[PDB]
Design a protein around this nucleic acid. Sequence first.
RNA 1: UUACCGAUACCAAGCCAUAAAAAGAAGAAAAAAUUUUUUUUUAGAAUCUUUUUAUGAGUAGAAAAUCGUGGGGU
RNA 2: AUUUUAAAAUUAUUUGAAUUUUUCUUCUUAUAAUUUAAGUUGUUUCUAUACAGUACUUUCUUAACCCACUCGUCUUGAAACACGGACCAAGGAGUCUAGCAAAUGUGCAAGUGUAUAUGAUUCUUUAAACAUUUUACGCAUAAUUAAUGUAAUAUGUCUAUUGUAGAUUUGUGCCCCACUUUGCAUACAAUACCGGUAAGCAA
RNA 3: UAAAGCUAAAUAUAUGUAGGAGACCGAUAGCAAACAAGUACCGUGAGGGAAAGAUGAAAUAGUACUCAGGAAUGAGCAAUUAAAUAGUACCUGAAAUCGUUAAGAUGGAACGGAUUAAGAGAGAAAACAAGUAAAGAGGGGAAU
Lengths: 147, 186, 47, 125, 52, 105, 52
Amino acid sequence: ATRFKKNRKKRGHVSAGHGRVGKHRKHPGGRGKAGGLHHMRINFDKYHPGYFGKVGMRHLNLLKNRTYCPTINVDKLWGLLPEEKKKEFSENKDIAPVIDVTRKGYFKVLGNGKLKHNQPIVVKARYFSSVAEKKIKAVGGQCILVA
Amino acid sequence: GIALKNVGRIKKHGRKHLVSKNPYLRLLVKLYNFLARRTNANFNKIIAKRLIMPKRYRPPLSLSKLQYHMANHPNDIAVVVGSITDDKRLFSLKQLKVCALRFTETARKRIEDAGGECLTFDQLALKYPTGKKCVLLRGPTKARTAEKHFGKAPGKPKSKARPYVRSKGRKFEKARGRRKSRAYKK
Amino acid sequence: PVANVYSTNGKNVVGEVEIPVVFQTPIRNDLIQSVYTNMSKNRRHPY
Amino acid sequence: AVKKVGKIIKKRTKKFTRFQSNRFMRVKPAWRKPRGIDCRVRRRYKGTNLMPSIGYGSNKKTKFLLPNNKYKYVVKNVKEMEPLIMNHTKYCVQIAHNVSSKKRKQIIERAKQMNVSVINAKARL
Amino acid sequence: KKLDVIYGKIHEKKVTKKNYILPKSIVHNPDIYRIIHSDKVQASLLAKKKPC
Amino acid sequence: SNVSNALVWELTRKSNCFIKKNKAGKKGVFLCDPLNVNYKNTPSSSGLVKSNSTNVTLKDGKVVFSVKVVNQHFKMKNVEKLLQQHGSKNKEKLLKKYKRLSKLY
Amino acid sequence: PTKIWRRWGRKVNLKEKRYAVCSSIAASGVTSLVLARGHRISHLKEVPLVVS
RNA sequence: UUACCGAUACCAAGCCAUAAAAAGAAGAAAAAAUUUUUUUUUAGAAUCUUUUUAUGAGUAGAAAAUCGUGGGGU
RNA sequence: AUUUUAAAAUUAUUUGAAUUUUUCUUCUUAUAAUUUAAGUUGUUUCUAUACAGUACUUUCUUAACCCACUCGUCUUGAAACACGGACCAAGGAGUCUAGCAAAUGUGCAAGUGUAUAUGAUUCUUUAAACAUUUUACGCAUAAUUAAUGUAAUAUGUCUAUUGUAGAUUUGUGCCCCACUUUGCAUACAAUACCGGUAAGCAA
RNA sequence: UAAAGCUAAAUAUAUGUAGGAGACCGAUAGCAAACAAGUACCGUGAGGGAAAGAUGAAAUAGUACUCAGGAAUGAGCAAUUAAAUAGUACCUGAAAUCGUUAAGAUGGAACGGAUUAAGAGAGAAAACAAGUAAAGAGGGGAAU
């Protein structure tokens, strides 16, 4: 789309929109992130506050596979399984769904949200938040620890 | 020579015509600004104005917020110019009569099973040309991520602007100017 | 929503067929145009 | 000055010429707005090559019509004459330059029986 | 006939575009002037006004 | 449903094999759609927008009468009578157009 | 200088491509659009014509 | 003390454009011949149509609408 | 083609009244016409009883009155005794890619993108199109901390934090507004809760 | 399970050769080179490095003959061709620059803007006359 470019509409305007006094020189402020702490310091401090310096210790080789764990919050367990099965677990008070969250692909169960009152539900996960446990037990369910 | 602001020409701001070249949306805009012009309804005027808006100003509305907003009046019709998205966090729907520009497949199916129905704006014009018993709703316009970077610059005192960074580890823009231990903080 | 089938001999009609539901999709001239430009770009040879 | 024939008033004749085109051969007379800094014409010094403006625009009721008080339409064959059958007194027809003497006679006779005037009727004969 | 199989009706295993839903229009019926001439909205329109 | 007269106009107001704009004399734009009585590019006159219409136009040196799905073609008194038996002001415009078209060799 | 690493091709969303194909079929299904495209179908019995 | 001359400023009117506004998704008019003919029109495109008012310098700079060129689909 | 209407004025009749007392006195009662309303109409000549001229339209060339300094550029300031330009033709300069954001259009939407690759009577075009046996990967769906890590009201209730403004809706005084009714977006606050840090306690 | 060894495929290929293509360039472009091009030519040398395509369908149509000239050439009542103002520098043949003829201007610049006037070129598409009756040439359509 080179015919939509703004330069085309400055075709006979001498300065090409880049100014008559200041001109368009090449790197008049330095290259890349050159002037940080010196003459681009205001830009750096105004838009990237904590840029300079270092904090914390070093993790030499990380291996993110070790600590990878996705989280599902407590208000999505009932939405994990289909609607007619929600209905069928709802009207019947003698059965509860057992959801292996790990199989859907989450490792930890977090506690944000609201479970349905007096609706037991059993959840299997590798990790649980304490509030997630409290809510699951409060609705009459149980948290099963799995690996 | 005469001393007038803007040389005497009234200046308006915002959209004047729809940018979308969607034929169905163009027909909708024609119908609804005809309705706004002819009827007195501020309802119709607002709908015609909102049909014109950019995508970021007709945000999706979840079924949860739809139900919550329509909680008190159950017999009226929720009219939303954005799209309607399904909320998995919601356990149960109830009998919703909603007119919207677009419906998600999941949200549509949930509404039909709950027993309500999904309405388009041409049907809304056909049945409620003035807007009796129609509650005008819209989703969160300032909730999108791009707005989290706006406002005071990140670095101004008491600024909640989210910066533009590659990633958010400890070694990415977290040392000098973000904690008292390194020079200042914010 | 019907359409009858014509024989290769053009001057007679054979069985009717119900119109497939695909014919009820929005025409969307802008969408098909833009998709056409993007897709037709893929056939080009480099220079 | 303004030229006024009938209801058609042409607000200006003698089309604008490019500044300095008179005394430079490399500068064609076709109008170009001079950017300059100290440019005379741009600054609108009196007595030097005034620039075109929107104020010279002819009125829209009589904008595009020829001195015969009708709009011109350029045709390439007899097929493009059909729309003129309805507005033969609002449109005159001009035959395109690259039309042969084969087709020019046909277009002339068709326009004659269609009762629509032809601008360049006596071309190529 | 196979168009219907391809696009969701009468699903077949290796022919139907799997779990693809035909696009939905944003208007139920584009007969804009028919819905304008409907008497329900004709009653809603107030008296025709006049230019300056 | 899926289509309507307004929608067809919305799709064919710009892109159309029958539109001819007047490049040299900027005033006019004609629509030579075979069911266009007066060749204005207008939804109220465009034959392919109108649900039902009729007009007279010459084909390969013969003047024919076309009526609009159910596209019928027929061949002054004859024109009057088939206009009467296919009728739906515009009638007199059709008659005037035919009588002025008949003078074409 | 022109370089071979210009963005020759484009990536088109599969859903958008399917929408476009469906819309093209629908458009081929109506008489006015086929006529306006440029085809001479004034003697066809119906636009979505099907043969044995 | 009068009269007069004197601007791209002021006033009245026309026209262009910009901005804003009021409003809008179907029927016969005239003329010329002699009851009948003939001639013009007989409109309806929403970034559209009709009408109204105000306004119009401009470097650097920005935007819109336009005008052209090689080549590609239709 | 349903305001060049209505009225206003005038004229000619007509009704009653008033008053400056009447040949333009005023106010209505009716009727019918006019325009001073409700932006120029008429008459007569000429063009001319021609088919292109000595006229009319137009281009060009010359004069004449008034006016008019080389452009481009740097510059506060250029006609400059500031620099480049003898002339003409052709060529001649914000592009391409990567990556990010904003804006807008489009599709789908708590999901989105099918990556590499595979299949398939596709193999001029085709190096594109078409497709993908019911947890690949990116981004998003949760944050916070150097970090072991921890991780969002809370089961009294499929209710969904609280205010002040606020769009829309509902009724009472189908076209005003004041009372009710509902309370989107958003703004300004207040609250809870999550991570970290303090402080208190600490099996 | 080091300090010994071998091993195909999936991978890469600004080289060479041979194929096939292109939203590429179209003789100041595209390779430096469309041609006798890494040639001519330059430098002691390492190296540097061009310009230059097009008559016509057919030269198996490349200009015969005459006159004048020492010859080049020119001219023709002569001659090929559809065409020689297509004659080998040969398609087209712009501008700068120059010639011929005509018209005009002309007291130390010229051109110009605005307004007309006088001349000179061109011109009828609004810049008059539809119809009507007759006779001459034509073209169509409908009616059996």
